[PDB]
């Protein structure tokens with residue numbers, strides 16, 4: 001349902 | 012912050028949002 | 040938010056979305072009170088009856104948002120959490136007394152047209168504004184109905200309610216650390232916070248200095264927008280000594 005967020009914020 | 016609670020797109024440019032007057036009218 | 044409307048762009052630039060990393064979903068609302076500090080409800084982070092006990096690494100904060108689900112490239116900013124602080128006397132066992140928490144960000148967020156902190160009330164602000172009939176404003180991306188979900192941030196203006204009326208509306212024990220807001224059945228108008236709006240701000244615009252103050256935090260209600268029920272909000276000023284203690288010690 002949510003658009004993916006940039007990978008840098010999930011590191 | 013000295014600038015807290017003043018919105019860039021409203022208070023900062025002296026524009027009012029569509030319903031803030033409803034709040035003001037309740038402050039009797 | 041039930042029976043509210045779409046926010047205007049930049050209408051609530053202190054609005055924060057607490058975002059779960061996995062699965063990716065809305066966890067709660069919150070508010071920006073400085074470049075490094077975010078205010079929310081304790082039950083957004085800690086609520087054992089629902090097996091909720093988040094750690095810093097479980098969550099992200101998304102600031103400057105309007106769309107609920109979109110990644111708002113070049114507008115929103117996403118911050119990691121350095122540390123969570125929950126009120127030491129938060130009562131999750133009974134009635135959500137002292138339903139308040141702070142989150143310190145790993146790095147300061149840059150303010151913009153869409154990102155800007157709200158003021159916290161002092162004693163005089165609170166005395167002047169926290170009166171029955173005076174309206175505040177609640178915002179969030181929570182459910183549109185008790186039993187769906189909004190495209191963009193929702194807003195509703197609601198009147199503060201007399202304490203005895205709040206007390207008589209529920210069997211739950213109310214405390215001085217709470218206030219309630221909403222329309223009565225006889226009043227026709229409606230509106231309430233709901234699931235997902237938890238932790239977001241109840242704000243009032245001071246007619247004395249034209250600044251927005253966060254008087255409450257979305258805390259609890261029996262259902263959403265039910266006739267004869269009201270929403271309950273953490274009384275921010277009553278708990279401000281704790282807020283200041285935490286920021287002074289850890290900031």
Ligand SMILES: C[n+]1ccc(Cl)cc1CNC(=O)[C@@H]1CCCN1C(=O)[C@H](N)Cc1ccccc1
Pocket residue numbers: 082086133134135211231232233234235237257258259260261262263269270271272
């Ligand atoms: C659902 N709703 C309605 C109005 C407002 Cl202003 C906020 C909320 C969201 N809050 C909630 O859903 C909170 C989280 C835990 C249970 N809860 C509730 O609101 C419970 N429905 C009522 C309750 C209050 C105090 C203690 C235990 C249960």
Ligand SMILES: *[C@@H]1O[C@H](CO)[C@@H](O)[C@H](O)[C@H]1NC(C)=O
Pocket residue numbers: 085087092094
């Ligand atoms: C919540 O999590 C912490 C550990 O991360 C734990 O020590 C605590 O007992 C848990 N329950 C609380 C704080 O009620």
Ligand code: NA
Pocket residue numbers: 206207208209210211
């Ligand atoms: Na009662």
Ligand code: NA
Pocket residue numbers: 221222231264265266267268269270
């Ligand atoms: Na109601």
